[PDB]
Amino acid sequence: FCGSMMATGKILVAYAPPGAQPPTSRKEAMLGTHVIWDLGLQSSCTMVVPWISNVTYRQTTQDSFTEGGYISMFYQTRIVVPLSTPKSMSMLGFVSACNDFSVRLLRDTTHISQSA
Amino acid sequence: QRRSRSESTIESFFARGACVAIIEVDNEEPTQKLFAMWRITYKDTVQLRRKLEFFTYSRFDMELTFVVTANFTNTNNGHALNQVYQIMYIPPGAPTPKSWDDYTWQTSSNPSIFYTYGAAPARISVPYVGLANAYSHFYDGFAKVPLKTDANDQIGDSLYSAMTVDDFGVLAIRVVNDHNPTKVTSKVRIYMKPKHVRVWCPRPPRAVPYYGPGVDYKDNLNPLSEKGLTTY
Amino acid sequence: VLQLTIGNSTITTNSVVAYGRWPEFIQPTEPDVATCRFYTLDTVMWGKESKGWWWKLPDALRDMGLFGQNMYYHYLGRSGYTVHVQCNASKFHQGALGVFAIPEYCLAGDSDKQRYTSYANANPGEKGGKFYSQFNRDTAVTSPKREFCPVDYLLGCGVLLGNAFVYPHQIINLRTNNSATIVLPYVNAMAIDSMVKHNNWGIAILPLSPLDFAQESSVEIPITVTIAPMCSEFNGLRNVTAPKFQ
Amino acid sequence: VLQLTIGNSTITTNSVVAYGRWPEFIQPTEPDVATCRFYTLDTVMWGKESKGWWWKLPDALRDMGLFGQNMYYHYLGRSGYTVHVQCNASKFHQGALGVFAIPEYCLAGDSDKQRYTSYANANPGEKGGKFYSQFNRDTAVTSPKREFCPVDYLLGCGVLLGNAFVYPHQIINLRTNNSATIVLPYVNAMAIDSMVKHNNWGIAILPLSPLDFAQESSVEIPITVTIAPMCSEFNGLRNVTAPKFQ
Amino acid sequence: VLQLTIGNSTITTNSVVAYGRWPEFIQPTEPDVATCRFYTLDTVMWGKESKGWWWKLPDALRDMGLFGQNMYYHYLGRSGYTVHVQCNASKFHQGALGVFAIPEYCLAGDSDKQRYTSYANANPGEKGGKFYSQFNRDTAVTSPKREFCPVDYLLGCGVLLGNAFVYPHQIINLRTNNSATIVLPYVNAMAIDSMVKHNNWGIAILPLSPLDFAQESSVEIPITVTIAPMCSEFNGLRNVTAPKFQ
């Protein structure tokens, strides 16, 4: 959270494994894995997405069989800011791998290119 | 009893290398056959397929052997030096080449073979690269599920018995030699020898000719021949 | 007489275990009572000209009890099954029902497009489907049915029905037995897989011998398929999945 | 900072245990994962003139997750609860929310007929209800609303709201705490009782002090009630119960 | 509160050690007092539209104290650093400063000629430089500026600023901390290298979130970068090096 210290609120960060409708609403997002993050207490919340998958290894491409899931954020309680405080604040998100994380079948990245 | 089951073992039943694909690669002028990307699968040929459809699940360390046979086309008196063929792996996600002189042929992380024509066929072993704990020769489901909240039917419309669109990537074969006026048409035959094969949930083999990559069938649905009931 | 009781469901009568493996578990969510009931599918009449029926598991148990609810709410679930096919027949009824449990029972479509059958027609559920004597091709190009065209002697998968006994099978021979029980373990390439999209098993009730009774014109007896999810454990609780069945 | 995690739901912050008893079990059907999620009720705005809100447990958790499904499919189920009432307020917001957990929270009806309130209006569920400053009598004799008429200072049950602290209570005082957690054990005359008809608990969020902020005309902050069924075990699996809510 | 004291310089406040390695030595000339002072760079204002700042180490400490003198007189010197970026902000100021310590912080030039930036513009020193929203190409062919064109989201090196956290980083989030400290060991391909030409590290202070305060039009707060050479040892004493900075 990159808001003011006087800014408080609760953000529901929810991971919903695939196979159902994406969590378009907080009532649907709170059914799957989720964590309430108080912006006042802690400025950063770690939402760990456990390794839940049918296959032992998902593919790195976008494919519906090895799709990972859906990460969403909702306002459990809206942000409450006093006067003389920026009403609109930004936030950052950092993705990371856990110790159990692994990969295989080395390949060439699609990002880089070379015109020839 | 006393006769051994050596030749009948699963390792022995698949010990033979089966042509799974024939890739036509030319060195013609830029007038599309410069390179060719074949989606790696045994379902292009029916023999090894039928041998694998004998079982529902499989786990085998494959062994691919490429036999390249080249010829002179559109020329009675044609010349060209010994060609080198690049057989590059493009696993699901790796950038596929859009042309012969593409950067992806650099193979910085994609495994590739450079086979000199006339040498021994290019053999390479591949471990069990399956996502699941076993290869799924048969899949009784889909990749997507059309939900009630989908905007259209194509969002969840998936092919039956199809797990992933890019199953295991494409094998891109090209002639590393520059495009020569003399057109040399080459056929790379890929032979698949499953090794360390472990099979599960046996299934009866297809008695009707295959039709596509699934279990569908269109014609020739008469496997048995006419024979008397009491005729030996 | 064998009387098998599981959870809150009892069935009175031989039972065969598929592949000699009993359903067993591998934090999954396992309802020890709510999902062990013998859910009874829709009874199907075995007409004299009947060709067979087919159900997909766990697709069949998608609207019965809390098993379907746990299957739709959870992402991926593994579940063994116990299929009891009971066909009440008298001493004068003759016939045989091959009850085959095909792992990954892929069926063939009617259209020329391969693997073009839709999810709604490939997962009929408790209703199930039926086999056909021949392979009727779909001719509606404007609105393709996108449904299976299962053929009895081809088992809907191009294989011969005679070899279908490689699968876990049980023959309900009305002269010696009026019921059959097959205990299927969770068979899948994965230790646990999404059930809403994947059908772990396929039950095929095919009349190997036609049904006759006292030289009557038309004879039809009920067949009741009662499936019990054994050791059904799910994981990935999340919003309910509501597939489109049209 | 306290961060309580149960099943697949985590809540970051003091928590109080009702009657000093922790939810514990007594063949019941206990989903250890599917029913332990912190189901989030509908967020309610704490207006400046707000009088309070009330929910019935487990009535509140009747349509959220598989807990409601197990509650309707099974005959009688016992379930402890963990109610986390979180009210995001700034340093300049003043107010206090009494979060009371009334065992057998009987409310008063609006009509002159005693105990005439209907089942639909007495079990609003996730929506809940609200208290009123005075007791407005129902005057529609042709079509009686048959709904509660909860009064703030009477707690909807004729008792004084000041004495309502005899119940398991927690005060969300926006100056010292923005959230409250109450762990309610299964309180009932019976070891286990039907949940579709009986409401084991009643949560009452009453503003003990009005909400003010920077001398503003109208101020409203969100209040989110997240209830987690702890040690919820059901028994008597049978056909789903579909109550009439109109 | 942490109060770190080194040599004759004390700083009152979390501190992070780069790559988990503390600055340590490998006849080098090591001033244990004259080079351990926390030399304070020029304070920079964090405008509302600011894009970021970048300094090169030890280039930044080339004119401050005897560290610069030992750096110019000696041929090759190795020196760890301790960078304390302090940004005084009130409770109502919002923003985040990513303080990244890029080893071998190569920046991109503005001209079309690759690696054409001059030594004077590539080593600004205590002044440092600033990032730019877009990549403005140098158009002065008669007199090329030969200066970097650092882009915020590209980190001036073509990489994404989001991945810049692979480097030793510290986030000054004005809500939780007003200062950051990064202890960089001597990182270089060589055990010791010429400092007048080589910049062992590069400090990048990039606003990850824009600075806002009470909905004001323009808000700017000071940022002070105080770098302390730790375990700075030089070798090859010889005539002073006087680089051309124009």
Ligand SMILES: CCCCCCCCCCCCC/C=C/[C@H](O)[C@H](N)CO
């Ligand atoms: C020159 C480098 C070539 C590297 C070749 C390695 C590619 C690995 C792919 C082999 C996978 C084929 C075996 C799997 C078959 C699948 O089970 C069926 N297509 C159906 O699921």
